[PDB]
Amino acid sequence: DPGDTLCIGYHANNSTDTVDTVLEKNVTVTHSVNLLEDKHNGKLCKLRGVAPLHLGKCNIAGWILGNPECESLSTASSWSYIVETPSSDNGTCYPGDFIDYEELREQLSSVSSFERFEIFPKTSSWPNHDSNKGVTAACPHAGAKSFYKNLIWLVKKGNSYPKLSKSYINDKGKEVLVLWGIHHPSTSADQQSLYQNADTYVFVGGSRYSKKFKPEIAIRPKVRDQEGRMNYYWTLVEPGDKITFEATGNLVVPRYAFAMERNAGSGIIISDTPVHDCNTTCQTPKGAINTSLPFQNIHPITIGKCPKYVKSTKLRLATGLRNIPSIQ
Amino acid sequence: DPGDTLCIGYHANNSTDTVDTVLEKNVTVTHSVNLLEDKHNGKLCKLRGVAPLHLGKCNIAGWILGNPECESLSTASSWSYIVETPSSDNGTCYPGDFIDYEELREQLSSVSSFERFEIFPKTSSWPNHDSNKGVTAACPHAGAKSFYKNLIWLVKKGNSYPKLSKSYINDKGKEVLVLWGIHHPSTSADQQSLYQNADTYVFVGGSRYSKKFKPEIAIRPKVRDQEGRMNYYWTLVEPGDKITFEATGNLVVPRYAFAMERNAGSGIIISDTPVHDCNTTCQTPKGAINTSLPFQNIHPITIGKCPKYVKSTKLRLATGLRNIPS
Amino acid sequence: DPGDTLCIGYHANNSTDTVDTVLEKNVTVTHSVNLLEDKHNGKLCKLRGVAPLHLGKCNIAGWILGNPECESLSTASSWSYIVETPSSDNGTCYPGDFIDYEELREQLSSVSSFERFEIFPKTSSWPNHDSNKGVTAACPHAGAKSFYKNLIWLVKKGNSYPKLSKSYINDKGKEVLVLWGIHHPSTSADQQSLYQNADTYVFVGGSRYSKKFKPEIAIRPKVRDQEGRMNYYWTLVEPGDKITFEATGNLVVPRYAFAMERNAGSGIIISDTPVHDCNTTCQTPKGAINTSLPFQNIHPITIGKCPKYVKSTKLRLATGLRNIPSIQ
Amino acid sequence: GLFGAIAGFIEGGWTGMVDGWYGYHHQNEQGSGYAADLKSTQNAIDGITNKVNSVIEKMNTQFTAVGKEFNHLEKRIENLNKKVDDGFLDIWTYNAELLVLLENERTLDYHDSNVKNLYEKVRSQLKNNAKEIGNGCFEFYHKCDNTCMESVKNGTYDYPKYSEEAKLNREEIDS
Amino acid sequence: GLFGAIAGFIEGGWTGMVDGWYGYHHQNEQGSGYAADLKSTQNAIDGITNKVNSVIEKMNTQFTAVGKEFNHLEKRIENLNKKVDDGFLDIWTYNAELLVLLENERTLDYHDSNVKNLYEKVRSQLKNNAKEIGNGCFEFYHKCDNTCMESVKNGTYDYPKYSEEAKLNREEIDS
Amino acid sequence: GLFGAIAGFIEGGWTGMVDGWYGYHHQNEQGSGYAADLKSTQNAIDGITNKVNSVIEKMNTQFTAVGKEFNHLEKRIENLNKKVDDGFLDIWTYNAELLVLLENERTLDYHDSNVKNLYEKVRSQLKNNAKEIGNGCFEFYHKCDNTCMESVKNGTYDYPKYSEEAKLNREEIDS
């Protein structure tokens, strides 16, 4: 034959990418993709474009009540998720039991509107009650005995504590978060020394909320030099609804309320990861993830539309041919 | 060579059905079946052959208490699931808190035996206490002031409200649901106007139940022209067991109890879907699903042995060959 | 035409093993393996090499409180899981309510260290109160009236019940579990017959715990020949923390505490399956599972690293060829 | 598609053959017509019927009411209920979609094998007594009447009977 | 199956061959016997071994206690717990059953391909020096002795060595 | 692989070929050169691209806060949350690892099938006008210039055009 040649063959290159199959492993292929997202920017970013709320040295309990070390942050306009730190100690300086702490955090994780206003002004609401000496040594402010910024510790005005009765109606047209505290003194002498009365009561009542409180007086172990306890309570008020306060003592009256609109449930990230100016749609405590891959291995705890977390370290998906550049 | 020919070929038809594959999309095929159930009959059918319980105008709280608008308690019957409506508003007419309302709804979702009997007859159990003037304006019955059908509001008979202690032993042989209530007035003058004594207590106790109730007197914002509140409670009593009611005031004694046998935990459907006479094994708020297909997209909240809910709009599976005419 | 032949063929044997494919069923194959684990040893072995805590006649309530019948049960310093029997009715002999009982059972399901110690020595802690007459007919021991081993029912000494205030500081170095009880007598005459004072209060106080109880006196139906009730309470004490007990009656003071170190959340098995001396890495109520298969059908309620539970009855995975020994 | 038979060296399918999935088309002096290979067709029907039943009849579900009701103070466990429902939804939606993609490709390749092997059957049966004219057709080097056509289908083709005749016919046109 | 080798043009298996999965059967003046091709059999053995281990070793579960205890007032979260456990059982049962239903079909087709390739390897090593009598068998136009047979099984068959002998035998037979 | 083309009767691949996955290597009087088949390679590109998007874009996730917070008296629901988290983790990890294992070789078998089909496409064209010298190559019995080479690559080789020339060289070689 007048020798002419035509062969059929396949591509090869210098790729060292290795994939695995059910029958074979360490198969070197020409081209491949990684189906597992395994890297993050290492920054806390803004879900849906909305920046998060970072509390720093304070936790949510300290931030919502106004601990003296708090409120130095950038107040609040709106946020997608709440960020604390592994050392966010400064919260309830006065020992006590914050009622439904975990449930409140879920509600506050994401908000559309959030404005703070003085629901009960200090100067023109408590004429017969002393809203000036209600401070404690357990809540210092640069060495000065202070108290929560959003709460007022009402005590007797010399020797007079009349039956307090103050009410408020939700004019804002939104949900209003109201927080108040109940003081439980150590000794019965401390009861009269602060409220001038022996057997007192506190009542808070709305159209749905109705509960009465009787102080429980006993000596507890010293916590930040405090043998008494102060349990903090909270509730939400529907628009155009009256909330009634009626106490003869041992009531930490609200001073600042919050008119807010709650979003769908979000998360709370606790990490030392810094916050920068990036958007992302997937956020993890390690960092933010910007990928279209269906799987990730950065952190099981994710907020937002995120890839499903897997324990895999390599999901190399073969797309090209078997790489055979040299036949031995 | 006469040119006789034999050829090998495959089928083709007018089928326009398309199926997606891992490598190709559309790919018209001759024969295919849909693995996804995407249609419903739009009816609320008898699940396990047992008809449901449609409260209609009322909700569960009003039905079990006996609100004047909540028809009656039917007869000795049973149901497979409870049907409410978004418009169902008739419930606790007097403002208050139904304690463990969510839990009681799940327990009452499906029962196989049910019967309402007068545990404490009205005119043969409370001689010393008034059992006729215990009504309020917030619970109308065709216009007039009334109260719950299954509950009695006991007040002082003129000026006499002595100690009360009435007990019942569960002779029915089944679990008995006992519901009561505690009244919390606005002012102590209202407390005296109703129960004479201004310092009363309520104690309810069975073999397991042991709790003592103290009223709270304070002024609350008016809800349906009531500044007072009335919380409602419930418990279950084993057969051959005694429950004790002991109160000197502020107690809403039960009139009708419920002897029942509970099923396994079922669901409650809240939708405006009409109820017709039909049988099904899967029930959803949108409608019933009568299929053996493993997947569905009608509604994620299913009741019964149901296909798994998926977001897929189409899960057609190829069974025939690639339709290649022309 | 010389005639020599060479043929290519496939192997066949006498195996009747059958497998299923998506297109065919009951396909006889030459070699196969089972992917489903259906074999259990029928014994309760030791997860992580740690023997479980078998309670036998009692449940967790009786064992932790010290119900008479729950005498020497294991003693023992650690357990991987707690095993009750389906008929173990010896718990709280005196009727009442165990508060957070299910939570306590989950918390006690597995510990690393466990030390019972006399937190309030009977010989010295109660000189002003009667610590011996506090027995009842509801808690028998060899017919005689008795009470819980770890608790002391304090009653009036003579006709005097002075105010009680005794405290403990956690010097063990681990968490200490403290359990106490509140007694609710049937009649006020019985209240005076036991604690003299007719209006009493009980207070328990730690750095984190602060709650005060008031007895609720009424006649309940006779349960184990008792018209009174006795609620039970428990809490954990952090190392170095002080727990304060204050009462004027109706308080079942602790006598023994538990200095323990907790593990991750284990489970509790209710089965009559005997406990034998075997190790295993997976445990079920029916028995232990020793396998490397990925699936099992023995029992859905597994404890430890176990194969996933499936409804499958036979998962026969083919490894050989289609067995065709003869042609018809 | 994977074996090259369907949409390959047999470009199109027959709309006239309706008595099966794979078959034959003959033509001689007597006539023509389409006949389906009932043997291979029934094998695919049984397999595909098992294929549909295998996917459907492995879904073993119990009675379950998904409906859960949580009060205003139980938002946390309420989210856990929705996390479970969303997680189950994502798992089943992803698996159901990919399962359809897998078995649709398997089904098409399975049909490709049947068509390819049916052609291989006849090609290895006729041998050189017929000419491969492409497009899944054979041209006989002899007089293949109706009885001869049935022999190939119900595979009983007497190759020795026509072997000597086809030997001379092949050489004559070879001139 | 999908390739038509196992239960296809080779109708049955060899119960007399015991040293491997796929192999040869020869016959000459020096005798006959069954021998299994060592490389191809080991290739399937290694691949199938990896197939089983891939299904098993990809399952990695942590310590987990499924047991959960709830009281009379925790029915709602108790039913949620069952919804989790029933959902996990339904997913795993469906996946495990279909996984075996799929990889078993792959396993059988894997053996079918291996038999086909072995026939092709020998077929495209003897060429016209042997005649495809069928049923996965070759008849030699020359005389293939024990040395010649081992060359075929070793993949080192010398075609030009025996081609001249096959040239004369083929022409005389095909007269 | 599964079709015996890649790493089979074509032992290795071509480093020189860089314009596609599958192709040809001609050599005649004018010269030689690698050239990829622009239809099969493009078809394989579409399939594999659709393969990756099918796996990726079938995942449909919503906004979800995985993390949960529980107090000292909510250990039981806390453990239930981890059972949901760990259970979801175990399900996805098993599926993801095995999905890659299943599809990787299916892609490799897909490439193996495409190469073999390309060899069959050319072989069905040249017929006896070329001699299969093996290793995926053909040797022409006639003179095939650059225009003739493109006709084969275009799938329009004119067998009748060169049949007479190949007929003379085929039997002259025999003598």
Ligand SMILES: *[C@@H]1O[C@H](CO)[C@@H](O[C@@H]2O[C@H](CO)[C@@H](O[C@@H]3O[C@H](CO)[C@@H](O)[C@H](O)[C@@H]3O)[C@H](O)[C@H]2NC(C)=O)[C@H](O)[C@H]1NC(C)=O
């Ligand atoms: C903000 O957080 C810091 C903690 O990072 C608080 O200061 C710290 O308070 C603790 C607790 O009182 C002090 O530790 C020890 O306290 C006990 C009394 O409980 C005492 O016996 C020990 O001698 C010791 O002081 C700790 O020293 C103290 N300081 C620091 C720098 O950590 C701080 O009070 C918080 N502020 C507010 C406003 O909440």
Ligand SMILES: *[C@@H]1O[C@H](CO)[C@@H](O[C@@H]2O[C@H](CO)[C@@H](O)[C@H](O)[C@H]2NC(C)=O)[C@H](O)[C@H]1NC(C)=O
């Ligand atoms: C231990 O459990 C047994 C029951 O298993 C208790 O004895 C039972 O007491 C009840 C009281 O209602 C009687 O009805 C039974 O007849 C008794 N059964 C017996 C004696 O076998 C026993 O009291 C429990 N506790 C202690 C501390 O003994």
Ligand SMILES: *[C@@H]1O[C@H](CO)[C@@H](O)[C@H](O)[C@H]1NC(C)=O
């Ligand atoms: C996020 O996107 C918004 C628009 O949706 C844009 O205004 C904003 O600057 C972005 N933030 C970044 C890129 O950090």
Ligand SMILES: *[C@@H]1O[C@H](CO)[C@@H](O)[C@H](O)[C@H]1NC(C)=O
């Ligand atoms: C195919 O044709 C038949 C007969 O006319 C008809 O009944 C059927 O609906 C057609 N299918 C289509 C158009 O999909």
Ligand SMILES: *[C@@H]1O[C@H](CO)[C@@H](O)[C@H](O)[C@H]1NC(C)=O
């Ligand atoms: C097959 O025969 C062997 C002995 O040759 C024996 O060990 C084995 O049990 C037999 N198995 C079956 C299924 O007949």
Ligand SMILES: *[C@@H]1O[C@H](CO)[C@@H](O)[C@H](O)[C@H]1NC(C)=O
């Ligand atoms: C269990 O393993 C431990 C590991 O130290 C070993 O000492 C012990 O003998 C083993 N016991 C049994 C019963 O397997």
Ligand SMILES: *[C@@H]1O[C@H](CO)[C@@H](O)[C@H](O)[C@H]1NC(C)=O
């Ligand atoms: C059809 O094939 C069967 C099975 O080989 C055979 O018995 C029969 O004689 C054949 N008949 C015809 C007419 O080909």
Ligand SMILES: *[C@@H]1O[C@H](CO)[C@@H](O)[C@H](O)[C@H]1NC(C)=O
């Ligand atoms: C068998 O083939 C190998 C190469 O695969 C060669 O080295 C060897 O010499 C051959 N013969 C024998 C007897 O091993």
Ligand SMILES: *[C@@H]1O[C@H](CO)[C@@H](O)[C@H](O)[C@H]1NC(C)=O
């Ligand atoms: C190439 O093939 C196409 C499609 O069959 C045809 O239209 C065209 O004429 C061919 N051209 C050459 C140069 O072979």
